[PDB]
Amino acid sequence: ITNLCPFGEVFNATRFASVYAWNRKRISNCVADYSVLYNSASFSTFKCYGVSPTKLNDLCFTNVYADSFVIRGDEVRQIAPGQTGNIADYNYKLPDDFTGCVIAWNSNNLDSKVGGNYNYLYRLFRKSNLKPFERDISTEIYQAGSTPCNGVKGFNCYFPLQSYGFQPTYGVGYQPYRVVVLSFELLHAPATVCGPKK
């Protein structure tokens, strides 16, 4: 292998998905130079789970998966194993034995708009919490009572998605943050993604 993994295409994308419809890219058969991620002046969060960031270029994996989406700053804490909240329960769920890294940065200057950017949505109601790496993009009316909703919003009948409506004057906790989750997948199969030191 001599092709580099396309980390810049993930981190430097113009468009990011809503967290309820989170995006996933599969990265395979490439040399991964994680050094692009070191000492970023943009990253407000850089945590790894099960491996240490310093050792990333010495590791090999079967596949790497890059999930990306937008949430608010207050919700970045939920993008980790063992968390609870609207995002972890109904939108994007990591497993208790997660092996990967979570990176996030403020995107107020890209994803806010005076008057509100309502393109970013999150699921607010669900009959049950998501399993790890499950994506729910249903728009079925949430039935909160015994009365069927028959597909119409009403009393005890709620549309399940809600918009962030990001505005640049919002406080930091409410500002958009772009998030990238890199999952390191190790199967009983030859490694296709390796650091430059391996």
Partner: antibody, heavy 120, light 109 residues
Framework: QVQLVESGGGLVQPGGSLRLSCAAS????????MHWVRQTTGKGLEWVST???????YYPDSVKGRFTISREDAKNSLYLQMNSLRAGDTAVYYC??????????????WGQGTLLTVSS | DIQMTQSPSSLSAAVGDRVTITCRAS??????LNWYQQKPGKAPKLLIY???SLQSGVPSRFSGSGSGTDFTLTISSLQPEDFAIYYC??????????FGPGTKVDIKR
């Protein structure tokens, strides 16, 4: 014998700055991650900063913007520059080697500590 | 982050006694757990890594067990030189490693 020896702790006024040093011997310094970990009676052991072998640096939020870790492999040396010091930074500062067996990371060697006192 | 809790806060035992200390992580951390010993005026000393691996040169009376969220450090036969504070530390989330508050082991004589 791996040895780590901290230097540079002492008295410094609030708002002031100070640099800590750590001298290493007994291993290939460039081949290991290095760390700063501080200790106070009130909050126990607390991770302060990390530098890997690729120039990558890591800080807790309480410290980002104020402290800077660095390393001089030619002198087997580790540094922590500290600016904007507050009374709450008073602590014993240890340098520590990081190492791993498989995926399991640990701090296998510690210096003796150097006391930083932030007082007017 | 991951909060670490230790029990008991302190304990008095006699030389030769089996001492047993426990560590709890606020969430599952598998076997990503280390134990350190600290004697007065000295730096921490690594005793156990990966929940149960005994670091080289550490006496065999020290042993670590546990998995998920609950972990145990055991001194099979307390020696006088073991008077110390013992800390656990989760190695699952980096760079934000976190330590337990410590357990003090005093010697009864």
């Amino acid at each position: 014998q791996v040895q780590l020896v901290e230097s540079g702790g002492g008295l410094v006024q609030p708002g002031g700055s100070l640099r800590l040093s750590c001298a290493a011997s007994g291993f290939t310094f460039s081949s290991y991650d290095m760390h700063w970990v501080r200790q106070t009676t009130g909050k126990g052991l607390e991770w302060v900063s990390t530098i890997g072998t690729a120039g990558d640096t890591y800080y807790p939020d309480s410290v980002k913007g104020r402290f800077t870790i660095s390393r001089e492999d030619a002198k087997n040396s580790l540094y922590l520059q500290m600016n904007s010091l507050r009374a709450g930074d008073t602590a014993v500062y240890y340098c520590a080697r990081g190492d791993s067996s498989g995926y399991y990371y640990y701090f296998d060697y510690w210096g003796q500590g150097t006391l930083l006192t932030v007082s007017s | 982050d991951i909060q670490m809790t230790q029990s008991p806060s302190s304990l008095s035992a006699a030389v030769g006694d089996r001492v047993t200390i426990t560590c709890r992580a606020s969430q599952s951390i598998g076997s990503y757990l280390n134990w350190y010993q600290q004697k007065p005026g000295k730096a921490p000393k690594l005793l156990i890594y990966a929940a149960s691996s005994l670091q080289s040169g550490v006496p065999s009376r020290f042993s670590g067990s546990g998995s998920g969220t609950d972990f145990t450090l055991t001194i099979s036969s307390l020696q006088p030189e073991d008077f110390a504070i013992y800390y656990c530390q989760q190695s699952y989330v980096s760079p934000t490693y976190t330590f337990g508050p410590g357990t003090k082991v005093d010697i009864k004589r």
